[PDB]
Design a protein around this ligand. Structure first.
Ligand SMILES: CCCCCCCCCCCCO[C@@H]1O[C@H](CO)[C@@H](O[C@H]2O[C@H](CO)[C@@H](O)[C@H](O)[C@H]2O)[C@H](O)[C@H]1O
Ligand SMILES: CCCCCCCCCCCCO[C@@H]1O[C@H](CO)[C@@H](O[C@H]2O[C@H](CO)[C@@H](O)[C@H](O)[C@H]2O)[C@H](O)[C@H]1O
Ligand SMILES: [Ca+2]
Ligand SMILES: [Ca+2]
Ligand SMILES: [Mg+2]
Ligand SMILES: [Mg+2]
Ligand SMILES: [Mg+2]
Ligand SMILES: [Mg+2]
Ligand SMILES: [Mg+2]
Ligand SMILES: [Mg+2]
Ligand SMILES: [Mg+2]
Ligand SMILES: [Mg+2]
Ligand SMILES: [Mg+2]
Lengths: 698, 700
């Protein structure tokens, strides 16, 4: 049967490739040229990024093999290739799918055209899911079972003298690869995306607002795809992989931590069989999630498309989530029934214990999404207050947006607090990680619905460059914008969950062979009364704020570089100038996110790094929530004024447009980069704590 | 004996502040037309003060009743004592400031020079500074004497069990009540006064001020309300909190270090050493107040203003350094058990911590300056970005604040690390005390600031000579820069004091059953506990929500004043704002006060510790960001107005972008930041107190 679960990744990959081929079959003369224009620009950006990322990955794998065991470097390469493949597939799928849906809208008059766009987005969603789970299964087989990485499950010592559970180190390397690709995609692509929006909206004003023949306008469509299709997909992939890797690390290290030396011999209080089963269970959970998501997507694409698009995708999400719930019910119920010693791990239900954590994480993600919706949409009270206040002043608009974000911080944080508390009550930290996984159990469906958004935005833009077709694409673009906001909120929540699980794995990875005799209370400890920890937390929070602030100036500078530049059309592909600049400009923030654990870890030690991690996680969650919600609220409040639904080209509209020019880079670059900051720093620290746990120079 | 010459320092400061008040009152006011407007501001400020005092004393009565019911009466008495001390300091400073602007302006005209008028302005600010210092040290010395020695609360130093059954060391509980009173008065002053101040600023603008706008008078009153009363009370609170943290740490380190070795319970740290450590921070603060008075005396005697005030600060600070040197070397030379407390250098060890705080505060101050003034690169870049667009100005301001967080935070981190290395958590608290040792001088310069601002408004009131206006106008800009530095110093010291208070919270978490437990096990807040992590997330969310509510409250109060001004066709508009502001402060204050209680009784003490740490982190970061962003926006607007930018003058499009960004920055820098400082510190105090009751009483 496990051979029939291993088949789910290949099934998903083949089904996504088939969806790609079928949309290639979908029909697209003047309109087709622009789609070719955008596809070529996206391919140039992807090539530049891929070259840079693979050079960096070569260096990363070399360092990993030199300073740790080599299998971790090999797994890093595997995961990086998986993520790059998913991103490239989705973007290539979409660049040629943007116009196809428009041709579907005219030929099908609304209704059938949406089926094409969703079959497109499903390509990227299933690609993310299948590639991630494929990399993980290959790591568990080739390294886990083939090489006997689960057979040992004892502290292996590197040739230089580094101690670690080998399979935990390998899964950590895989998570690191995913994190590197996700960081490059989102940080660099977001810098480029908001530089393109800023350059387009400024060039319209430079010499008309969003001109169609503006090169930066084409770049902006490309950036929407780079951000919410490729970048967001990679971010969700990273969070999901991180949750799974945290679960696996926790199990592997609960193997050595729960031992008792009554005499010379050492008796494992948790048998190796239990540790193996706990290492394997999250993978089975993710595979079940992928299966349920594919079933839901199949029912959605096949059945008679209703007029209301949002209800269809919402029902797809509900199907995936609740089906995964009910099925992993049995998986959790039987798989963990035979394990021995689960009361020591903290399981309040034995076999089904973690399933509760998973489901509560699912509902947590759902609720946080709903919260983001409530605070960022014109259909609810807060955005309406901002839109109506637009008459009061421009400074009033900015202050009200900042206050709205600050207030919105609370509800989702309370949701996450309750989810964490109940997941802990159920199954300890392993269950907290399992709850994060459950939240991201249907990561494939989430990524697909998120990719849908940019395609709809591109369809509306295509209408802007038939009256019924233009209006229908505009409505599709608005629904896509709402879905993208919901996706950003869900991604932030899952990122907080993954970063917390990775901090837990970091504390668990800090186990040492000398601590074997010590009780569990001594090893799994990061005291907050130690001055080193407090200083580390302050430093991590300040670094998170510094990263978020730097992203704003980077977007502005890249946009200014695009402004400096610029057969009547001939060939204009300025994107590289911005993209290359973005790839250079994102260099410094990345150096922070990766190198902060090492220096402070080698300067002060592992306890200081834990404080840096917790402070960074907290500050990043808060700042990301604030920035994302502020940007989304400014955008849709401006949309409300555009329709004039209540309360165009006026003074209030000027205040709103300035607030949106500020919010775009904040919600589409800073926010989306902060979660990556927290999670990748957690991963890098989890890995390097093996080296600077005892190697601290002060 | 000899301590009786330190016991006199608070009364000395109080008498000297009264003497400064009398000597300034002797000074003439000059022209009558300006004096009339000054009288109007005095009446408005007094009405606001009366409303505030009535509300705050009602709330303090309720608080003291509950405290005495659930704890020892000595704690309620000390709470009322501290509240009265802070209220007296605030009222005295406010009267001095409201009545001191006209003296400086008329002195500028009479002596045709800035020097002589500045002597009056500094004698004014010194009233508030010395009032803060003297009242604080007086309350603390009275608590150390009447309760500490007379009843033997420093004699016993053992766990007393209340009638309801709550356990605690008595003197720690008493000092905590004192800190609670100070915190309540500071919350009222800063939260309410900031809401009103920025509502009046928003009403004023909703070439500097409108003609006879009622909000013009309101804004003149609010400038005094903020940097004289509010900022002074905040610095006083941080300084008192550092001292109380040191004292609590000593009181609880007495019982925590016990060993049943030797065939009987042996206190590892002798009671004499614990007594000396309880007394040392008080004497250090008294020495600091003395040095501050000496420095201010040297400054006022002799006939560029900033260099003079900077020299006052340096004199006070370095004199405290060199004097607490011998204080530390002799007082603690005979102490026993410092190796258990963590002193790696014995007697003078903690003295280093003190200086490490002092030099850190200075550095942190300078850091604020660097990021918030147009005389340095960041504000210049913002002013130049004024040309590209308004949204660019807003984005660049936000980015500047987010980046500015780092330098001062790194300073604080290194200071904390070195203070720990020197003398443990006790030394961290001692360093907070040293940083705020010259609180009188800091508060004095901070009060000087708006004395100068409204005096410049006073000079521009009526009409006045352009040459005369320039001399008074120059005083106002120096005040603005110094006030930005003071806000930075206050935020940094508040973070440091709140950290010391969290350490005191963990030490207060000691229980008689935990007496047998090892020292490492009792003083522990694991960050891997899900309760703790959830508490941190909740605290950060609460901090952000608090800041957002403060923004909305400022806007609502400004709208109320605008609507009342529409009705007009005196002091009625000020009262309306005061009422609205006090009602608005009900909700955030209730958050800050009841969050520890609810979270502790629902979940427990570890969740409360997590809430505290998360709130401290988020509040420090948000306060730094808001204060620096607002100040930098203001100075960049000045850069464009000053003509440093060429081609663009007042009323230009770049200036429009800069002024809009400044209207956004104002409420953030004058309300959100200072109220965040108050929030973090008061939540630390409330948790430190209530952990005695909900340590084991958590219902979920
Ligand atoms: C179910 C998967 C089986 C393979 C089918 C894959 C086709 C669907 C993916 C389309 C997107 C990529 O576009 C595809 O890229 C790869 C090269 O990189 C090339 O495709 C070829 O190489 C790949 C990899 O060696 C093989 O799967 C296959 O022999 C062939 O499809 C083609 O140039 C192009 O069809
Ligand atoms: C067992 C027999 C089969 C063994 C086959 C192994 C072959 C491995 C050598 C592959 C060499 C090609 O290496 C290629 O590099 C470029 C990046 O520069 C990537 O190529 C990918 O991105 C680039 C830039 O967008 C585009 O050409 C294209 O979209 C895509 O093919 C792929 O990573 C890889 O296809
Ligand atoms: Ca927008
Ligand atoms: Ca100002
Ligand atoms: Mg836009
Ligand atoms: Mg547009
Ligand atoms: Mg977009
Ligand atoms: Mg668009
Ligand atoms: Mg567009
Ligand atoms: Mg103003
Ligand atoms: Mg003004
Ligand atoms: Mg004013
Ligand atoms: Mg003012």
């Amino acid at each position: 049967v496990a051979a029939l679960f291993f088949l789910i990744p290949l099934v998903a990959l083949g089904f996504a490739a088939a969806n790609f081929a079928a949309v290639v079959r979908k029909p697209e003369e003047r309109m087709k040229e622009i789609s070719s224009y955008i596809r070529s620009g996206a391919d140039s950006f992807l090539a530049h990024e891929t070259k840079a990322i693979f050079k960096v990955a070569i260096v990363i794998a070399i360092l990993l093999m030199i300073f740790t065991t080599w299998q971790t470097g090999v797994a890093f390469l595997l995961g990086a290739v998986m993520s790059a493949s998913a991103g490239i597939v989705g973007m290539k799928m979409a660049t040629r799918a943007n116009v196809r849906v428009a041709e579907a809208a005219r030929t099908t008059k609304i209704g059938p055209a949406l089926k094409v766009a969703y079959q497109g987005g499903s390509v990227m969603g299933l690609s993310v899911g299948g590639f991630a789970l494929l990399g993980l299964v290959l790591v568990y087989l080739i390294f886990g079972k083939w090489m006997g990485q689960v057979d040992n499950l004892n502290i292996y010592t590197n040739w230089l003298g580094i101690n670690f559970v080998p399979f935990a180190m390998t899964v950590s390397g895989y998570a690191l690869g995913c994190s590197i690709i996700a960081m490059f995609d989102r940080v660099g692509g977001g810098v480029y995306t908001k530089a393109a929006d800023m350059a387009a909206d400024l060039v319209g004003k430079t010499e008309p607002e969003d001109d169609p023949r503006n090169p930066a306008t084409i770049a902006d469509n490309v950036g929407d795809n780079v951000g919410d299709v490729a970048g967001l997909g990679a971010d969700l992939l990273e969070s999901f992989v991180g949750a799974i890797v945290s679960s696996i690390i926790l199990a592997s290290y609960m193997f050595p931590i729960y031992v008792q030396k009554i005499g010379e011999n050492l008796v494992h209080q948790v048998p190796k069989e239990t540790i193996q089963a706990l290492i394997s269970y999250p993978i089975f959970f993710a595979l079940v999630g992928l299966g349920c998501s594919m079933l839901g997507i199949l029912y959605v694409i096949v059945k008679k498309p209703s007029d209301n698009p949002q209800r269809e995708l919402n029902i797809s999400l509900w199907t995936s989530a609740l089906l995964t719930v009910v099925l992993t019910a049995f998986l959790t119920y039987f798989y963990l029934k035979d394990l021995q010693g689960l009361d020591v791990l903290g399981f309040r239900f034995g076999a089904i214990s973690p399933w509760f954590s998973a489901i509560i994480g699912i509902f947590s993600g759902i609720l946080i999404g709903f919260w983001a919706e409530y605070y960022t949409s014109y259909r609810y009270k807060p955005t309406q207050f901002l839109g109506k206040s637009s008459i009061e002043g421009t400074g009033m608009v900015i202050s009200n947006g900042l206050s709205l974000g600050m207030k919105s911080v609370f509800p989702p944080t309370l949701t996450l607090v309750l989810g964490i508390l109940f997941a802990d009550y159920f199954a300890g930290l392993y269950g907290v990680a399992i709850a994060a996984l459950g939240m991201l159990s249907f990561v494939a469906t989430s990524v697909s619905v998120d990719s849908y958004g940019p395609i709809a935005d591109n369809a509306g833009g295509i209408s802007e460059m038939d009256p019924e077709v233009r209006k229908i694409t505009d409505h599709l673009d608005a629904v896509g914008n709402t879905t993208a906001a919901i996706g950003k909120g869900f991604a932030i929540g899952s990122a907080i969950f993954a970063a917390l699980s990775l901090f837990a794995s970091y504390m668990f990875s800090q186990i040492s062979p000398s601590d074997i005799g010590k009780p569990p209370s001594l090893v799994l400890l990061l005291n907050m009364l130690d001055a080193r920890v407090i200083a580390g937390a302050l430093l991590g929070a300040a670094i998170t704020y510094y990263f978020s602030g730097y992203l704003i100036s980077a977007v502005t500078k890249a946009a200014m570089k695009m402004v400096d530049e610029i057969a009547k059309p001939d060939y204009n592909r300025c994107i590289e100038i911005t993209s290359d600049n973005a790839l250079k400009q994102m260099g410094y923030p990345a150096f922070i996110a990766i190198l902060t654990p090492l220096v402070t870890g080698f300067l002060l030690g592992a306890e200081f790094v834990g404080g840096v991690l917790i402070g960074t996680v907290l500050s990043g969650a808060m700042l990301a929530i604030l920035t994302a919600n502020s940007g989304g609220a400014w955008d849709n409040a401006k949309k409300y004024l555009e329709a004039g639904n209540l309360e165009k080209g006026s003074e209030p509209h000027k205040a709103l447009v300035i607030g949106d020019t500020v919010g775009d880079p904040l919600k589409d670059t800073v926010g989306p980069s902060l979660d990556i900051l927290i999670k990748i720093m957690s991963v890098v620290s989890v890995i390097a704590v093996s080296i600077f746990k005892h190697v601290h120079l002060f």
